[PDB]
């Protein structure tokens with residue numbers, strides 16, 4: 001009711017400001033998209049194990065991509081950056097974040113408690129404490145309000161697809177969260193109900209199927225190829241009844257776009 | 258910015274981590290409040306993480322300005338613009354004479370501007386009370402203490418069940434609703450509005466149940482007519498006493514028609530019907546608002 005439009009407008013301004021550098025991986029001498037994929041997949045499992053909000057996961061990946069836009073990291077340290085990011089996102093987003101010992105424990109003692117704490121401080125400095133970033137998740141839940149009527153499977157499938165985009169910096173780093181959410185919502189809607197991106201969201205977002213097309217073409221491929229992807233933790237996660245087992249729904253073969 | 262350019266003056270409060278100092282920039286002359294946050298082997302407190310990231314997004318005349326974060330090995334200093342007094346101290350100094358209506362109305366208008374801006378930027382304050390509102394010598398009042406604040410989503414999910422100091426805590430928190438939202442800040446502001454007028458707290462309970470019963474005795478025990486779904490709320494009990502709603506002119510007797518109308522909309526039971534800060538800015542109570550300086554040192 002009140003503030004829904006003001007908040008949307010504000011998130012659309014901030015997502016431009018909070019966006020990582022699209023090129024950053026080519027400037028990283030020692031890490032790759034493949035290593036990032038492995039890290040993000042591990043963070044999904046951490047979220048599983050400690051029962052963290054989906055929002056916490058998206059925030060952490062945002063912190064990582066922004067950190068890596070200015071800081072060169074060696075491959076043996078990438079997981080430390082990821083652990084600190086997840087700790088920060090947890091402290092920001094969770095009612096009950098896990099304790100620091102729990103974060104040390106799940107890095108299989110690669111790192112010490114002091115390292116994790118020092119990396120937390122470093123990540124805060126580099127991000128200049130700007131932690132309140134817009135995520136695909138935050139756009140999705142607003143878009144869900146435009147369903148007629150609400151459909152739990154559509155919501156869950158949209159969240160699953162939004163989560164898959166986190167894993168692959170190529171191509172997803174080039175799309176804004178609001179755009180990825182638009183593609184994931186349409187694709188979910190289309191898969192479950194056969195319906196399309198509603199004109200009511202065109203009025204709200206200014207996006208049409210035409211302007212969502214590039215992201216949607218990528219996401220559709222990601223969806224088709226998901227069972228063959230080397231990272232599988234998101235598919236496993238979305239088999240649970242919590243998410244209505246949406247990772248077992250068959251993707252459509254074509255979109256018409 | 259760094260610690261060498263600041264000269265500490267006096268202690269002006271102690272929240273935690275814990276002290277707040279008045280200090281002076283030696284090169285610019287600017288007077289500031291230094292909130293120290295001690296760095297538990299659990300790293301940076303989540304309360305500081307939220308307080309700082311939210312404050313850095315909120316630049317508004319009626320929200321306390323975070324100027325800088327001084328960021329060393331074992332210490333974390335937040336540098337704020339300094340304000341003379343908190344609203345709680347001001348009301349004590351006005352003990353006997355009271356607070357002029359134009360000031361009360363000015364302060365409420367400004368608090369509502371401040372809060373509408375928070376809510377527009379998806380921030381819930383969650384600890385509005387007189388000691389968290391700061392006033393200066395020019396007639397400004399500002400929201401401060403964002404240590405309990407949080408960035409919300411649309412629509413909200415379940416957030417921390419604690420929240421809001423008891424006297425200012427909304428019925429929906431007290432009845433354990435799974436979802437609460439911006440309406441809880443408005444409830445707190447309505448309590449503070451009443452308190453500026455009477456100079457005593459509107460519902461000073463000492464426990465959750467005592468707090469509910471005081472609200473019920475003032476506003477009537479809510480039924481399904483006034484608040485659909487209330488009798489199915491988690492901490493609702495069908496044994497609750499059923500008090501009649503009293504003449505609203507008796508709740509804050511000095512208030513005239515427009516003030517009462519506005520107060521009644523801020524204290525509406527159903528969070529859906531409760532007035533938003535944005536809509537309240539346009540209430541006829543404010544038709545003649547000005548911004549006088551406080552009438553006191």
Ligand SMILES: Nc1ncnc2c1ncn2[C@@H]1O[C@H](COP(=O)(O)OP(=O)(O)OP(=O)(O)O)[C@@H](O)[C@H]1O
Pocket residue numbers: 269270271272273277290321337338339340341342343388389391401402403404
């Ligand atoms: N910018 C400021 N200018 C002047 N005084 C301030 C400022 N910030 C805080 N104070 C004083 O210190 C008190 C405590 O600060 P604040 O409320 O921000 O932190 P807190 O941890 O909640 O402390 P408390 O629980 O004691 O209120 C305030 O009530 C106020 O009187």
Ligand SMILES: [Mg+2]
Pocket residue numbers: 272388389402
């Ligand atoms: Mg306080």
